[PDB]
Coordinates of C-alpha atoms and ligand atoms in Angstrom, one line a residue:
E30 CA -12.4 30.2 10.9
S31 CA -9.0 29.5 9.5
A32 CA -7.7 29.7 13.1
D33 CA -9.7 26.6 14.1
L34 CA -8.3 24.5 11.2
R35 CA -4.8 25.7 11.9
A36 CA -5.2 24.4 15.4
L37 CA -6.3 21.0 14.0
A38 CA -3.3 20.9 11.6
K39 CA -1.0 21.3 14.6
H40 CA -2.7 18.9 16.9
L41 CA -2.4 16.1 14.3
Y42 CA 1.3 17.0 13.4
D43 CA 2.1 16.7 17.2
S44 CA 0.6 13.2 17.4
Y45 CA 2.3 12.1 14.1
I46 CA 5.7 12.9 15.8
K47 CA 4.6 11.2 18.9
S48 CA 3.5 8.0 17.0
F49 CA 6.0 7.6 14.2
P50 CA 9.7 7.3 15.2
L51 CA 11.1 7.6 11.7
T52 CA 9.7 10.9 10.3
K53 CA 10.1 11.7 6.7
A54 CA 12.4 14.5 7.8
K55 CA 14.7 12.1 9.7
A56 CA 14.5 9.8 6.7
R57 CA 15.6 12.4 4.1
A58 CA 18.4 13.4 6.5
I59 CA 19.7 9.9 6.5
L60 CA 19.2 9.4 2.8
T61 CA 20.9 12.6 1.7
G62 CA 24.3 11.4 2.8
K63 CA 25.5 15.0 3.1
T64 CA 24.2 15.3 6.7
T65 CA 25.9 12.2 8.1
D66 CA 23.6 12.4 11.1
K67 CA 24.4 8.7 11.0
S68 CA 24.7 7.0 7.6
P69 CA 23.2 3.6 6.7
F70 CA 24.8 0.3 6.1
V71 CA 23.6 -0.8 2.7
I72 CA 22.6 -4.2 1.4
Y73 CA 22.8 -4.7 -2.4
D74 CA 23.7 -8.4 -2.9
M75 CA 23.3 -11.7 -1.0
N76 CA 26.8 -11.5 0.3
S77 CA 26.1 -8.1 2.0
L78 CA 23.0 -9.2 3.8
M79 CA 25.5 -10.8 6.2
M80 CA 27.0 -7.6 7.6
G81 CA 23.5 -6.4 7.7
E82 CA 23.0 -8.7 10.6
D83 CA 26.6 -8.2 11.8
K84 CA 26.1 -4.5 12.4
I85 CA 22.3 -4.2 12.7
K86 CA 19.6 -5.7 14.9
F87 CA 17.2 -7.8 12.8
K88 CA 15.3 -20.5 6.0
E89 CA 16.0 -19.1 2.5
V90 CA 17.1 -15.5 2.1
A91 CA 14.2 -14.3 -0.1
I92 CA 11.8 -15.7 2.5
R93 CA 13.7 -14.2 5.4
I94 CA 13.7 -10.8 3.8
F95 CA 10.0 -11.1 3.2
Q96 CA 9.3 -12.2 6.8
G97 CA 11.4 -9.2 8.0
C98 CA 9.4 -6.8 5.7
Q99 CA 6.2 -8.4 7.0
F100 CA 7.3 -7.7 10.6
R101 CA 7.9 -4.0 9.8
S102 CA 4.3 -4.0 8.7
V103 CA 2.8 -5.2 12.0
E104 CA 5.0 -2.5 13.7
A105 CA 3.7 0.0 11.1
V106 CA 0.1 -1.0 11.9
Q107 CA 0.6 -0.7 15.7
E108 CA 1.9 2.8 15.1
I109 CA -0.9 3.8 12.7
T110 CA -3.5 2.5 15.1
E111 CA -1.9 4.6 17.8
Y112 CA -2.1 7.7 15.5
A113 CA -5.8 7.1 14.7
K114 CA -6.9 7.2 18.4
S115 CA -5.6 10.8 18.3
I116 CA -7.8 11.9 15.4
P117 CA -10.5 14.0 17.0
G118 CA -13.8 12.1 16.8
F119 CA -12.3 8.7 15.8
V120 CA -12.6 7.0 19.1
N121 CA -16.2 8.3 19.4
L122 CA -17.4 6.4 16.3
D123 CA -19.1 3.0 16.5
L124 CA -16.5 0.5 17.4
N125 CA -17.2 -1.8 14.5
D126 CA -16.6 1.2 12.2
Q127 CA -13.4 2.0 13.9
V128 CA -12.2 -1.5 13.0
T129 CA -13.3 -1.4 9.3
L130 CA -11.8 2.1 8.9
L131 CA -8.6 0.6 10.1
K132 CA -9.0 -2.7 8.2
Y133 CA -9.0 -0.9 4.8
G134 CA -7.1 2.2 6.0
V135 CA -3.8 0.9 7.3
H136 CA -2.4 -0.4 4.0
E137 CA -2.9 2.8 2.1
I138 CA -1.1 4.5 4.9
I139 CA 1.7 1.9 5.0
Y140 CA 2.7 2.9 1.5
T141 CA 2.1 6.6 1.8
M142 CA 4.6 6.6 4.6
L143 CA 7.0 4.1 3.1
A144 CA 7.4 6.7 0.3
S145 CA 9.2 8.8 2.9
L146 CA 11.7 6.0 3.5
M147 CA 12.4 5.5 -0.2
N148 CA 14.5 7.1 -2.9
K149 CA 14.7 5.9 -6.5
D150 CA 17.5 3.5 -5.5
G151 CA 16.2 1.8 -2.3
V152 CA 14.5 2.0 1.0
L153 CA 15.6 2.5 4.6
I154 CA 15.3 -0.7 6.6
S155 CA 15.7 -1.2 10.4
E156 CA 14.6 2.1 11.9
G157 CA 17.1 3.8 9.5
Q158 CA 20.3 1.8 10.3
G159 CA 20.0 0.1 7.0
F160 CA 19.3 0.8 3.3
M161 CA 18.2 -2.0 0.9
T162 CA 18.6 -1.4 -2.8
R163 CA 15.6 -1.7 -5.0
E164 CA 17.7 -3.8 -7.4
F165 CA 18.6 -6.4 -4.7
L166 CA 14.8 -6.6 -3.9
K167 CA 14.0 -6.9 -7.6
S168 CA 16.6 -9.7 -8.0
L169 CA 14.9 -11.9 -5.4
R170 CA 13.2 -15.3 -6.2
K171 CA 10.3 -14.8 -8.6
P172 CA 7.3 -15.0 -6.1
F173 CA 9.1 -12.1 -4.3
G174 CA 11.2 -10.2 -6.8
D175 CA 8.5 -8.0 -8.1
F176 CA 6.7 -7.7 -4.7
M177 CA 8.3 -4.5 -3.5
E178 CA 8.9 -3.0 -6.9
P179 CA 5.5 -1.2 -7.6
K180 CA 6.1 0.5 -4.2
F181 CA 9.2 2.2 -5.5
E182 CA 7.1 3.1 -8.6
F183 CA 4.4 4.8 -6.4
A184 CA 7.0 6.3 -4.1
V185 CA 8.8 8.1 -6.9
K186 CA 5.7 9.7 -8.3
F187 CA 4.5 10.5 -4.8
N188 CA 7.8 11.9 -3.5
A189 CA 7.7 14.4 -6.4
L190 CA 4.9 16.4 -4.7
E191 CA 7.6 16.8 -2.0
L192 CA 5.3 16.8 1.1
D193 CA 6.3 17.6 4.7
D194 CA 5.6 15.5 7.7
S195 CA 3.2 18.3 8.6
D196 CA 1.3 17.8 5.4
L197 CA 1.4 14.0 5.6
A198 CA -0.1 14.1 9.1
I199 CA -3.3 15.7 7.7
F200 CA -3.2 13.6 4.6
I201 CA -3.0 10.2 6.4
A202 CA -5.8 11.4 8.7
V203 CA -8.0 11.9 5.7
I204 CA -7.2 8.4 4.3
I205 CA -8.3 6.8 7.5
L206 CA -11.6 8.6 7.7
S207 CA -13.0 7.6 4.3
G208 CA -16.7 6.7 4.5
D209 CA -16.0 5.0 1.1
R210 CA -15.4 1.9 2.9
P211 CA -17.4 -1.4 2.7
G212 CA -19.4 -2.4 5.7
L213 CA -19.5 1.0 7.5
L214 CA -22.7 0.9 9.6
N215 CA -22.7 4.7 10.0
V216 CA -21.2 6.9 7.3
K217 CA -22.1 10.5 7.8
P218 CA -20.2 11.0 11.1
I219 CA -17.2 9.6 9.3
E220 CA -17.9 11.9 6.4
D221 CA -18.4 15.0 8.7
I222 CA -14.9 14.5 10.2
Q223 CA -13.2 13.9 6.8
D224 CA -14.7 17.1 5.4
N225 CA -13.2 19.0 8.3
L226 CA -9.9 17.2 7.7
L227 CA -10.0 18.0 4.0
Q228 CA -10.5 21.6 5.1
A229 CA -7.4 21.3 7.3
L230 CA -5.4 19.6 4.5
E231 CA -6.4 22.2 1.9
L232 CA -5.5 25.2 4.1
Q233 CA -2.2 23.7 5.3
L234 CA -1.2 22.9 1.7
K235 CA -1.7 26.5 0.7
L236 CA 0.2 27.9 3.6
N237 CA 3.1 25.4 3.6
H238 CA 3.4 25.3 -0.2
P239 CA 2.0 28.5 -1.7
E240 CA 3.8 28.7 -5.1
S241 CA 2.8 25.0 -5.6
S242 CA -0.2 25.3 -8.0
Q243 CA -3.2 23.1 -7.0
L244 CA -1.2 20.7 -4.8
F245 CA -4.4 19.9 -2.9
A246 CA -6.1 18.6 -6.0
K247 CA -2.9 16.8 -7.2
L248 CA -2.5 15.2 -3.7
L249 CA -6.0 13.7 -3.6
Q250 CA -5.5 12.3 -7.1
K251 CA -2.6 10.2 -5.8
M252 CA -5.2 8.1 -3.8
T253 CA -5.9 6.5 -7.2
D254 CA -2.3 5.0 -7.2
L255 CA -2.8 4.0 -3.6
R256 CA -5.9 1.9 -4.0
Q257 CA -4.5 0.2 -7.1
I258 CA -1.3 -0.7 -5.3
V259 CA -3.0 -2.3 -2.3
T260 CA -5.0 -4.5 -4.6
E261 CA -2.2 -6.1 -6.5
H262 CA -0.6 -6.5 -3.1
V263 CA -3.3 -8.8 -1.8
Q264 CA -3.3 -10.8 -5.0
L265 CA 0.5 -11.0 -4.7
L266 CA 0.0 -12.2 -1.1
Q267 CA -2.5 -15.0 -1.7
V268 CA -0.1 -16.4 -4.3
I269 CA 2.7 -16.8 -1.6
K270 CA 0.1 -18.5 0.6
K271 CA 0.0 -21.4 -1.9
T272 CA 3.6 -21.4 -3.2
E273 CA 4.8 -21.8 0.5
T274 CA 1.9 -23.1 2.6
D275 CA 4.8 -23.7 5.1
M276 CA 5.4 -19.9 5.6
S277 CA 3.4 -18.2 8.3
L278 CA 2.0 -14.7 8.6
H279 CA 1.4 -12.4 11.5
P280 CA -2.2 -12.7 12.7
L281 CA -2.7 -8.9 12.8
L282 CA -1.8 -8.9 9.1
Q283 CA -4.4 -11.7 8.6
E284 CA -7.3 -9.4 9.5
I285 CA -6.4 -6.8 6.9
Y286 CA -7.7 -9.3 4.2
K287 CA -11.2 -10.5 3.9
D288 CA -10.7 -10.6 0.1
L289 CA -13.0 -10.6 -3.0
Ligands
BXG21 C1 11.4 -4.1 2.5 O1 11.6 -3.7 3.8 C2 10.7 -2.7 4.3 C3 11.2 -1.4 4.6 C4 10.3 -0.4 5.0 C5 9.0 -0.7 5.3 N1 8.1 0.2 5.7 C6 6.8 0.0 5.9 C7 6.3 -1.3 5.7 C8 7.1 -2.3 5.2 N2 6.6 -3.6 4.9 C9 6.0 -4.1 3.7 O2 5.7 -3.4 2.8 C10 5.6 -5.6 3.6 C11 4.3 -6.0 3.8 C12 3.9 -7.3 3.8 N3 2.6 -7.8 4.0 O3 1.5 -6.8 4.2 O4 2.4 -9.2 4.0 C13 4.9 -8.3 3.5 C14 6.2 -7.9 3.3 C15 6.6 -6.5 3.3 C16 8.5 -2.0 5.0 C17 9.4 -3.0 4.5
KNA22 C1 12.8 -4.1 11.8 C2 12.8 -2.5 11.8 C3 11.7 -2.1 10.8 C4 12.2 -1.0 9.9 C5 12.2 -1.5 8.4 C6 12.2 -3.0 8.4 C7 13.1 -3.7 7.4 C8 13.8 -4.8 8.2 C9 14.0 -6.0 7.2 O1 13.4 -6.0 6.1 O2 14.9 -6.8 7.5

């Protein structure tokens, strides 16, 4: 029945709120400087990174920015893992499959959600107290300058669909439960859940965005851009592991990469 899927759409939206402090809705309130529900300090040059630590809670600059972005990713994983637990069925799967689903799944969700924190011109840093311009990032030293850039590229395409937090909650739940993923001992239970989630996503898209012709199809197509961006990410990473074999990396970010 439609009613059953509607109930699942709501259950996941509830957990999404509970698990992600910076909603897309909060983000686009901060970004659209109209509603000064607290406006961000912005960082656009080296000499403004200073008052970023002056006014905001947060070893060469380009490295220290990169480490700070890497730290927001472990926090992003922690939250994503918290959200998965709530997807009905998930905790019931084989444990080894729970991990692989997360191993491949988190990154794709990192950048889906990061799109909420972006406009064409920059990205919210530091829970929303900051805003760092895409140009300052692009201007960084050359093993880091073009690191974040293809994220802005994806975000601008993706932001165009203009999704809700209530749509994203079902969409990120789909991404997690792929079955497409290498090493899954047990695929059909994963696939059975995802087909029910794609039902929830489909329906929700039609109710929440009716005049938006074939958004469901257009959304699922954006998973093409997602995969491709995670891949040039890991190759960008392994390069920094040899340009600065003195720079560390969080262990929980280590496990996301058994490459090849
Ligand atoms: C640029 O500052 C921000 C602002 C908002 C963010 N939101 C989510 C996730 C973020 N982190 C990354 O993308 C990332 C990942 C790795 N990594 O996986 O080694 C390394 C460096 C950075 C983020 C970063
Ligand atoms: C540290 C709070 C996490 C939110 C975005 C992280 C960006 C922080 C930074 O790059 O300095």
